[PDB]
């Protein structure tokens, strides 16, 4: 289906972002990385008090927290491209807290964070993204 290809596109964006965050060596993706990184930096400083007290011990606990935060962020019924950027900024925050405190480090299984991020974006914001220009004409033209 079209949703399969749409899912893979978003998954690649989320993977790229995580590789950018960890500095592990496309246009839309580069634009996303630039804006999400400055979102993430601001968020990490505004939330030091909160975040210093958050344990991200596994991919499972990262997922639970991601899902709870996503539910609260979007419960007012508003989707926009700026909020979509914050999903990526937040996954970047989860990936840092995870490997900061992960006891047996595993970078490959961070595919898994990218996957549940893509699942959220696709199932909850995917139809909005389509009605709002897609990544290539909605997102890029706005944030480039």
């Amino acid at each position: 289906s079209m949703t399969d290809c749409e899912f893979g596109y978003i998954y690649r964006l989320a993977q790229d972002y995580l590789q950018c965050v960890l500095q592990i060596p496309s246009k839309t993706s580069r634009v996303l990385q630039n804006v999400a990184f400055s979102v993430q930096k601001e968020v990490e400083k505004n939330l030091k008090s909160c975040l210093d007290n958050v344990n991200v011990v596994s991919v499972d606990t990262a997922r639970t927290l991601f899902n709870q935060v996503m539910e609260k962020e979007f419960e007012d019924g508003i989707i926009n491209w700026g909020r979509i950027v914050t999903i990526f900024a937040f996954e970047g925050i989860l990936i840092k807290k995870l490997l900061r405190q992960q006891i047996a480090p595993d970078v490959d299984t961070y595919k898994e964070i990218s996957y549940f991020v893509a699942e959220f974006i696709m199932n909850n914001t995917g139809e909005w993204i389509r009605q709002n220009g897609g990544w290539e004409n909605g997102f890029v033209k706005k944030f480039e």
């Binding site: 804006v35 979102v39 601001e42 968020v43 505004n46 939330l47 909160c50 975040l51 007290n53 958050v54 927290l65 709870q68 935060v69 996503m70 539910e71 609260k72 962020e73 007012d76 508003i78 926009n80 491209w81 700026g82 909020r83 979509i84 950027v85 914050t86 999903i87 900024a89 937040f90 033209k141 706005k142 944030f143």
Partner: peptide, 25 residues
Amino acid sequence: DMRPEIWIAQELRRIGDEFNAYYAR
């Protein structure tokens, strides 16, 4: 107890909406 879901969601929502206003086209 602390509800980090609320503290984080609140900040992401705020900055998401600001950034939404700061970029256009």
